[PDB]
Amino acid sequence: DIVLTQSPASLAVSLGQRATISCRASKSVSTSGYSYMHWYQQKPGQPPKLLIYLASNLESGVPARFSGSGSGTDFTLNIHPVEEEDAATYYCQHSRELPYTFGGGTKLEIKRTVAAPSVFIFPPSDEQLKSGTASVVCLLNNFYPREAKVQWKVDNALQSGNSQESVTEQDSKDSTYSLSSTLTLSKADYEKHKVYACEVTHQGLSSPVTKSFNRGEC
Amino acid sequence: EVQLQQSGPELVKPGASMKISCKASGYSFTGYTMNWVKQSHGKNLEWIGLINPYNSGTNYNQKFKDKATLIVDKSSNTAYMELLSLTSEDSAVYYCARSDYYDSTHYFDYWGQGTTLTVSSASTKGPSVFPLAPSSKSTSGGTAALGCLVKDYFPEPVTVSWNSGALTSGVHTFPAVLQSSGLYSLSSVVTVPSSSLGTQTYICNVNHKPSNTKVDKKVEPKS
Amino acid sequence: EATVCTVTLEKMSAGLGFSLEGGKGSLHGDKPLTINRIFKTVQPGDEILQLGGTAMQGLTRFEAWNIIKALPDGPVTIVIRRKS
Numbered sequence: 001d002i003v004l005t006q007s008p009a010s011l012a013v014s015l016g017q018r019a020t021i022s023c024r025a026s027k028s029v030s031t032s033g034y035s036y037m038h039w040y041q042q043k044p045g046q047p048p049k050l051l052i053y054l055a056s057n058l059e060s061g062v063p064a065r066f067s068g069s070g071s072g073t074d075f076t077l078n079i080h081p082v083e084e085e086d087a088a089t090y091y092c093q094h095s096r097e098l099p100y101t102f103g104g105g106t107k108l109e110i111k112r113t114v115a116a117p118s119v120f121i122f123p124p125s126d127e128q129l130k131s132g133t134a135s136v137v138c139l140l141n142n143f144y145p146r147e148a149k150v151q152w153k154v155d156n157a158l159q160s161g162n163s164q165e166s167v168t169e170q171d172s173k174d175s176t177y178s179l180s181s182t183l184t185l186s187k188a189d190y191e192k193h194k195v196y197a198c199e200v201t202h203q204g205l206s207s208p209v210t211k212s213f214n215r216g217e218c
Numbered sequence: 219e220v221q222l223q224q225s226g227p228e229l230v231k232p233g234a235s236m237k238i239s240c241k242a243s244g245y246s247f248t249g250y251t252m253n254w255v256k257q258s259h260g261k262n263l264e265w266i267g268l269i270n271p272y273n274s275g276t277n278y279n280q281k282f283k284d285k286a287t288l289i290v291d292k293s294s295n296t297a298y299m300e301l302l303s304l305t306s307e308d309s310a311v312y313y314c315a316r317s318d319y320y321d322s323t324h325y326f327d328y329w330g331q332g333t334t335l336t337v338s339s340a341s342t343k344g345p346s347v348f349p350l351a352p353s354s355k356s357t358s359g360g361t362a363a364l365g366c367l368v369k370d371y372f373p374e375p376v377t378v379s380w381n382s383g384a385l386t387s388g389v390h391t392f393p394a395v396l397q398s399s400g401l402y403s404l405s406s407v408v409t410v411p412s413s414s415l416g417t418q419t420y421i422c423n424v425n426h427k428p429s430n431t432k433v434d435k436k437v438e439p440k441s
Numbered sequence: 442e443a444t445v446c447t448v449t450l451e452k453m454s455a456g457l458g459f460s461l462e463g464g465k466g467s468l469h470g471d472k473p474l475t476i477n478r479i480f481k482t483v484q485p486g487d488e489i490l491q492l493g494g495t496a497m498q499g500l501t502r503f504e505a506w507n508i509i510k511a512l513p514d515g516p517v518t519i520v521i522r523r524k525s
Contacts, residue, residue: 032455047329095324099279102263166392321456
């Protein structure tokens with residue numbers, strides 16, 4: 001079977017700059033005047049979208065900033081000038097012979113200016129508390145770069161091992177990320193304590209930011 | 219114009235089989251080959267096989283020869299893929315995609331939306347949906363965040379929208395997390411102007427098809 | 442208004458370098474086979490009337506492909522109809 005190797009595995013590129021992604025095939029995919037090599041873009045939650053077919057042809061409706069070139073065993077996808085909505089994973093695919101195969105993908109990050117998160121904390125709802133569990137949620141909204149640190153404290157006791165984080169894909173419009181951190185507590189424990197706090201560290205903050213609430217207050 | 223509509227997500231027990239459908243519209247079904255593709259977290263994108271609906275002629279990836287069977291139904295413009303003796307290795311998103319055999323070009327120019335299959339002996343569980351109420355200390359300036367916590371469901375996926383899709387700007391629906399319990403949870407949040415909190419209604423629409431659980435939860439300033 | 446003319450294409454091992462749409466029993470009923478894409482004399486929207494000795498009237502898209510596959514390598518005479 002033909003193996004497609006993409007390079008790099010990931011890259012970051014500034015707005016208006018040039019992104020270059022390569023695909024190398026384990027043997028030639030050119031024959032009869034064609035190179036049977038195609039390029040796809042995939043954003044989370046969506047199928048791949050065809051960008052370039054037969055190595056260098058632009059699929060209808062695809063913006064002219066995408067182009068491809070190459071032949072034999074070596075191909076390259078170019079995007080220029082790069083825009084916010086090009087944040088995605090890019091894939092190559094050959095149809096030279098059976099079986100058709102795909103490369104491993106290249107994730108493209110759009111660089112932008114440092115942006116500090118807006119931070120929000122959410123107490124457990126009364127509806128949840130009925131069921132014996134309490135979730136406390138800390139949201140970090142629209143920041144860059146992706147690296148962020150979240151620390152939970154309950155009555156100044158550092159919480160370790162009882163929270164989970166989730167991070168969005170890079171936003172297609174402002175190139176930022178968002179992050180939630182969910183602290184899980186039994187209802188009994190939630191009611192034993194008063195101060196609930198999450199502390200956020202990030203490059204865009206001069207000092208750490210804390211959001212907190214006191215249980216039973218508004 | 220062209221649409222490929224796949225059947226819904228499914229939870230299936232190890233050793234069973236299941237069929238995924240792909241209904242084609244907006245073009246001549248028997249004029250183009252239909253491909254099936256697997257996307258997983260192990261090998262990511264893999265081509266399974268294709269079928270020409272004109273004569274049901276097929277080519278398989280040999281890795282899938284004993285796993286997949288392709289058929290079509292001309293009278294309903296539908297392609298089917300049957301997956302046999304399922305294991306957890308078969309848990310993945312599956313896609314149908316159209317290709318053209320003219321000059322053997324076979325690029326995949328139209329795709330179905332994907333079908334999430336989970337192979338597991340655990341049973342289905344619908345989510346509880348809890349509000350993430352906007353803080354009373356939201357700046358009058360100002361911007362407020364609100365959301366809903368979609369907790370303790372199995373299997374993936376869940377879809378969330380806001381105000382029946384009339385609200386999309388500022389929405390963040392997070393990737394689900396797997397809890398130690400073996401159940402998933404996710405949050406969806408949105409930022410809105412603080413001034414709107416008094417007048418505008420915010421409802422998060424949650425759909426978990428594998429348990430047929432559909433919920434509309436109004437999220438209000440507490441209270 | 443439309444012109445019928447004769448053109449010559451090269452049959453390569455893969456095919457003739459275009460894709461057809463339409464034909465018998467296609468989307469909007471029975472329509473002619475037309476070129477909708479040149480994979481890179483003929484142009485998109487050209488109606489194919491004859492490929493070598495085979496008349497295209499009443500053929501499905503797949504039948505037309507088998508006609509193309511059987512064509513010997515080298516030059517192939519083709520009759521098309523083109524608008525205005």
